[PDB]
Ligand SMILES: O=c1ccn([C@@H]2O[C@H](COP(=O)(O)OP(=O)(O)O)[C@@H](O)[C@H]2O)c(=O)[nH]1
């Protein structure tokens with residue numbers, strides 16, 4: 001009944017797949033000379049990083065051209081476990097030597113653009129306990145097969161969370177209502193074209209996902225964004241103080257894209273907030 | 287900046303209010319106190335809340351009203367049996383058609399009360415305590431310059447909307463107000479001077495709108511907070527919390543001039559305040575300006 005509703009319905013019809021059952025073989029055949037890089041950001045994920053790598057490794061040399069763990073300064077056994085599991089481990093410093101690192105996830109994903117060569121870049125979190133081998137095929141399907149798509153968001157069915165449903169989706173309803181069609185805007189499993197990703201700033205820390213979604217929308221609208229169901233995953237039960245820090249940075253990043261000033265004041269406890277994006281990687285490479 | 291917050295907590299926050307009913311009665315100095323419970327279909331709890339306040343009626347408390355918001359259950363009869371006067375939205379402000387939501391109820395109660403101080407207490411509380419009203423009025427009666435008192439609950443050793451939505455948004459847009467522990471709480475008291483003169487946000491936005499307007503107009507030191515006791519976080523469905531969050535966002539955006547689309551969640555979202563009650567009840571308001 002609203003303009004938002006109407007666009008959502010058609011966008012789901014065209015750009016959302018609850019059964020993204022493309023085969024690896026057909027996706028390989030559709031690459032048409034494009035290459036695919038998979039990047040796992042990792043900070044102290046020794047218990048899970050190898051398991052994630054193991055689910056992607058069978059695609060290496062076929063659908064996937066490179067599988068990189070972009071280490072974020074781990075002090076546990078993340079790097080060596082990623083090595084043994086069959087990934088290429090690259091530090092923030094090796095990825096982009098000319099810029100000093102700053103903390104947070106967004107920095108890692110941004111730097112990975114300088115360390116990878118794929119025409120399509122896929123991000124998968126390294127803290128996943130139950131990774132499924134079809135994540136990468138499902139994420140790249142719309143990029144390889146669907147005209148005009150530059151960003152694919154992977155969502156999970158449940159057997160979003162609190163920040164998604166209380167913070168991100170309500171703020172998008174207020175500020176960019178067409179984007180409320182995206183089921184899991186904060187999700188860490190997603191893929192984009194190099195053309196898109198090199199051309200947008202990267203928000204810091206836990207702002208990176210929402211920043212990329214809004215910057216893509218502001219340039220290209222809903223037509224360029226797709227989503228795919230990766231399967232069933234249970235909600236993680238994270239501490240409220242962590243969720244609040246995430247909510248504060250999601251707010252800061254949304255406000256920075258939507259014309260709202262932000263005090264720069266992090267959370268008052270009885271938190272880390274940065275409004276400093278990294279510039280488009282095109283300004284340094286390519 | 288934490289110096290501003292530290293000083294406010296030192297002077298304007300009470301974890302253990304010491305006040306007795308007798309000392310508060312003795313401090314009224316001719317001021318009267320109205321207690322208003324908004325109620326929409328609260329038959330299971332409204333009587334218990336009223337019962338905790340009724341012993342104060344005729345002493346500390348001058349009026350005890352349940353503002354019924356269109357209930358179809360036994361809310362009215364049970365509130366009356368417990369000793370409250372029950373006033374419908376229509377009776378409170380008869381010439382203005384009612385609109386839905388909590389903010390409407392609190393706003394209308396201003397036309398149906400005579401107190402120099404108005405105390406709001408939710409009627410859905412499972413474990414009300416008789417010292418709520420004394421604690422909420424203490425800073426209004428015994429401190430100087432306080433106009434709004436927010437009652438907070440200590441938690442066993444705010445909720446999800448408070449900590450993920452309200453506090454982070456205040457950090458971004460009204461940073462001093464992050465010192466308020468439970469900005470969305472429904473137990474609070476205000477002066478007639480303040481409440482009659484501010485617009486009232488609709489629905490679930492009413493509390494945050496009043497907090498921000500008080501802050502802007504009267505300042506941080508006009509706001510106080512008091513610990514009402516230990517209460518466990520209420521476990522509500524996420525969809526309900528999301529609808530509340532969306533309205534909190536809308537009201538804070540209204541108070542900051544952020545274009546809000548008005549688009550709800552696939553939920554009710556209003557961007558329209560009710561005007562200050564002194565615009566519709568000017569003679570009542572003037573009679574109470576004292
Ligand atoms: O500074 C950071 C923060 C996070 N991450 C990675 O980004 C993903 C999401 O991080 P989050 O903090 O949400 O999860 P957690 O680190 O608690 O598992 C995980 O794979 C982290 O290892 C990272 O590489 N650098």
Ligand SMILES: O=c1ccn([C@@H]2O[C@H](COP(=O)(O)OP(=O)(O)O)[C@@H](O)[C@H]2O)c(=O)[nH]1
Nearest residue numbers: 324325326328355386387388391408409410
């Ligand atoms: O339109 C409304 C919505 C709420 N309330 C009252 O305001 C308080 C807070 O409402 P909430 O919806 O949080 O509680 P619930 O109505 O779910 O018990 C309660 O005493 C409600 O009865 C009201 O009078 N009118």
